[PDB]
Amino acid sequence: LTPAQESIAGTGGPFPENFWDPAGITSKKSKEEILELRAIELKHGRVAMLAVLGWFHVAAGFHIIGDLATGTYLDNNPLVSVTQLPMGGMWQTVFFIMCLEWVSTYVCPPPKSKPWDILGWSDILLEDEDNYWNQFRKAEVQELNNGRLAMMAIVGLIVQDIFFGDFGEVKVCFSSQTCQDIGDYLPGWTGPLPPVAYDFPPLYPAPEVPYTGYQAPLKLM
Amino acid sequence: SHAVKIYDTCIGCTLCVRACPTDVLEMVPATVNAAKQVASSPRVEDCVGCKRCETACPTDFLSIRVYLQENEETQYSLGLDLADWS
């Protein structure tokens, strides 16, 4: 690596200790540029995690603010629900996020050393503590990996919805969806027993002619 | 503040002094009893009024009496912690 690249080493790749960079984008960058890239990555990852959460939440139904605002049940497809939502709510959402960004970037700007530290953890946190109960690196890598996966997932969901109208419908099966049957609950099921195409034969033959005091084996049927 | 008074029935067993939570009392030399000492109350300003001295007094009726004075309550007698009157 390089002195600039080391500013984020240990928080990337499949294992934390790797540095995945096939394009070599960060090879020539300076430490400030690397920190800004990490800040962009973390902001995108967090926004993508929240976006996937909300996307699945609205695709399961559960879209009450929109339902009440429009006086009607909005389409489960989130991209359709965006258009179904009132401009009032849309501009309110945009304005609220704008206010959050303004506060986070002008009133309470994160430190230049940790541009991703929005909540100001690096004023009471002790990252360089040699205790066992100091898995902040684990927490950071979990955050980054989940955020990257959520970025890919949300982009895929949006692209698939735009192309084939498939929004990754969720089958929560409890409140918005009324599942009447065991087959509805578990695919391929039609009865109490699992849908196995194997008829379990008797391990031992039975007597064709019984005798007093037999007690033939019971059948689950 | 409360009024902690000591009467000559005192036998100087020191139990009041040992039970004091804020060290209001102290044994002083005397000739009235066989133990040759009687409890005193010099730091009555710190008395909170818990009557633990009174609980620990052996005599038939107490040789130490704590008279509560709610009108003259001070921060020391109230055990104020979060607020300061000093």
């Binding site: 918005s176 009447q180 049957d181 109490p192 019971l218 049927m221 | 909170v48 912690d81």
Partner: protein, 665 residues
């Protein structure tokens, strides 16, 4: 192992266990302290081995007591009950395994239950339990009673033996890994599997025959035979109005398998996050810590039982046996509350006797935010009721919070069963019906949350401020159960965890009374009742669906629930069935009022009155050398609390049971 040291010599000492009782019987406070500290094995003479001995042997003795009680129940069912008439026709005949004497005209208590039987209608659901178990013969009930008595004798022998088998070296009670593994795999897993086996092999054929109508001895002495593919719980037995017992047996088999699997993965160490719980594992290896945790667990399980025994029907005909379901719910809710306050108490005791966990070091924010949430919850939830009352009195219903007026819709209260439209009925009664939630349900649920949070506030404050506080810094030295620290520092009354429980019990009782009233009124108004004729039925409910219209006001609660539904209990004197319930209503009112004596008064007045009275005894030469004394401060509080709770619970008990008995008969 050495049984030569167990002699009846100590029986007459009466206080040997406590060293503080050595100066025997100088006053009546000595008697009261003897009773109070009888079972406080920790502070008694001996060693830790003796403490463990006493704890385990007492647990076994109580096990024997419970087995004796169950055997008595079985015997009463067998010989002093109309179980035969109930089994052949449950609807017509009310359960009754309880008969009263004809001493002073007391035969009036017995009421018509069957043609040949007269007695007191039981509300424990024991008949339904027997029917589910497949017990259909007096011989079977008699052998169940014999088994219960044998278990009682075995447990008594085990307690007596373990009082000496366990020595100071004994450590089997400290093997928490072994204890938990054994309980999880054998007591729970194997137990559930074995009970599923019992159901499949005994109860399923008998119950199927009973549903069909067959009562043949040869038959009484092919799983999934009648159950369709419908999800369990989505289809109730049309002829019984309860979940299929084959589904119940499959449930128990699955639960046992799951418990065995959990135990085996724990055995193999598959669970990995041991460190997250290691702190609790090290801290809570204490008698009182385990007692508190277990009491809370069983309180929560009792509350879940109270809810499920009614909402989810599994016993035959218990759904239509309205007194039974109501009494089961109320009883288990009360037990939940009592065991929760118990968990708080023993958490406080553990904090006093052992080192607390580190969440006690920021206790001020915790209790401060709990205080704020309690205040806000109470304000909003109860002030909605007060607003409704004031506005309705002023004559502005449009300004109140109700379904017709401003409405607080419970948006989050969403279905999960996915049941089909309609209701389930069985012989002129509504076995199952969906509860429709509105503004009244919103308000009452937030009242529930408020009361729960205030009780939790009291318990948590007692637990966290047990060792010390800003007021008094040596509360640990003071101990667990002391009345105060003195009139000083303004006054330190009821600063002890014992007194914190003494108040949390009042608040738990208030919460549970509101819960009982909510359940009772909602079920009467919106669930229970009869029906009058694809077919559509008009459902005539016992309370006539007045919960949603009248429950929005405290006046509505006072009038439509207490006054209106107290007609049965208040007018029960002439009626043979419920005259006892009316008398118990009156007597419980008396006891509750009598508790206020101890709750309001103080020790010194009674001590001075006792001395003035004793003057006359001394004058006449009646000198009691166990000098009479007024009850201690803590004892007065305990007596007042006990009488208060008992009186309130008795009034509610008689009121609800009288109403249900009269309405159903």
């Amino acid at each position: 192992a050495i049984f030569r040291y167990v002699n009846a010599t100590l029986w007459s000492k009466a206080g040997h266990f406590n060293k503080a009782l050595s100066k025997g019987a100088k006053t009546t406070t000595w008697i009261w302290n003897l009773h109070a500290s009888a079972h406080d094995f920790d502070i008694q003479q001996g060693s830790a081995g003796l403490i463990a001995r006493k704890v385990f042997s007492s647990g076994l003795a109580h096990l024997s007591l419970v087995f004796f009680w169950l055997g008595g129940m079985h015997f009463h069912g067998a010989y002093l009950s109309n179980y035969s008439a109930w089994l052949k026709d449950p609807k017509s005949v009310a359960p009754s395994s309880h008969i009263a004497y004809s001493l002073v005209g007391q035969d009036i208590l017995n009421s018509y239950t069957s043609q040949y039987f007269s007695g007191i209608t039981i509300t424990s659901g024991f008949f339904q339990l027997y029917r589910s178990e497949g017990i259909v013969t007096q011989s079977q009930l008699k052998y169940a009673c014999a088994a219960s008595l044998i278990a009682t004798l075995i447990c008594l022998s085990g307690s007596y033996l373990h009082m000496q088998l366990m020595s100071k070296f004994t450590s089997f009670y400290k093997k928490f890994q072994s204890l938990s593994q054994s309980h999880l795999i054998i007591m729970f897993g194997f137990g559930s599997v074995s009970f599923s086996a019992h159901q499949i092999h005994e109860a399923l054929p008998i119950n199927s025959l009973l549903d069909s109508g067959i009562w043949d001895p040869q038959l009484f002495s092919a799983i999934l035979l009648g159950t369709p593919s419908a999800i369990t719980g989505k289809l109730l037995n049309p002829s019984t109005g309860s979940i299929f017992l084959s589904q119940v047996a499959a449930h128990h088999l699955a639960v046992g398998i799951v418990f065995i699997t959990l135990g085996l993965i724990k055995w193999c160490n598959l669970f990995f996050s041991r460190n997250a719980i290691l702190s609790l594992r090290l801290a809570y290896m204490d008698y009182h810590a385990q007692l508190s945790i277990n009491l809370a667990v069983w309180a929560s399980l009792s509350m879940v039982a109270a809810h499920h025994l009614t909402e989810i029907p599994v016993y035959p005909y218990e759904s239509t046996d309205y007194p039974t379901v109501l009494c089961l719910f109320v009883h288990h809710a009360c037990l939940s509350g009592f065991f929760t306050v118990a968990s708080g108490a023993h958490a406080s005791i553990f904090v006093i006797r052992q080192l607390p966990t580190s969440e006690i070091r920021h206790r001020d924010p915790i209790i401060g935010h709990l205080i704020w949430v309690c205040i806000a919850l109470g304000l909003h939830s109860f002030g909605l009721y007060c607003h409704n009352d004031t506005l309705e009195a002023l004559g502005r219903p449009e300004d109140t919070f109700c379904d017709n007026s401003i409405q607080l819709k419970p948006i989050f209260a969403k279905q999960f069963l996915g049941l089909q439209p309609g209701i389930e009925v069985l012989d002129g009664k509504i076995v199952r019906m969906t509860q429709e939630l509105g503004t009244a349900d919103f308000m009452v649920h937030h009242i529930h949350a408020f009361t729960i949070h205030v009780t939790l506030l009291i318990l948590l404050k007692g637990v966290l401020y047990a060792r010390n506080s800003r007021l008094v810094s040596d509360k640990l030295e003071l101990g667990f159960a002391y009345p105060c620290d003195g009139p000083g520092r303004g006054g330190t009354c009821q600063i002890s965890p014992w007194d914190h429980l003494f108040l949390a019990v009042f608040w738990m009782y208030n919460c549970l009374s509101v819960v009982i009233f909510h359940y009772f009124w909602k079920m009467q108004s919106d669930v229970w009742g009869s029906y009058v004729h694809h077919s559509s039925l008009t459902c005539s409910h016992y309370s006539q669906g007045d919960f949603s219209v009248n429950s929005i006001t405290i006046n509505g609660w006072l009038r439509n629930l207490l006054w209106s539904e107290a007609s049965q209990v208040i007018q029960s004197y002439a009626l043979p069935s419920i005259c006892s319930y009316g008398f118990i209503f009156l007597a419980a009112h008396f006891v509750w009022a009598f508790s206020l004596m101890f709750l309001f008064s103080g020790r010194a007045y009674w001590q001075e009155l006792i001395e003035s009275i004793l003057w006359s005894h001394h004058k006449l030469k009646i000198v009691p050398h166990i000098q009479p004394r007024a009850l201690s401060i803590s004892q007065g509080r305990a007596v007042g609390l006990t009488h208060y709770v008992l009186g309130g619970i008795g009034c509610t008990w008689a009121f609800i049971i009288s109403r249900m008995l009269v309405l159903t008969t």
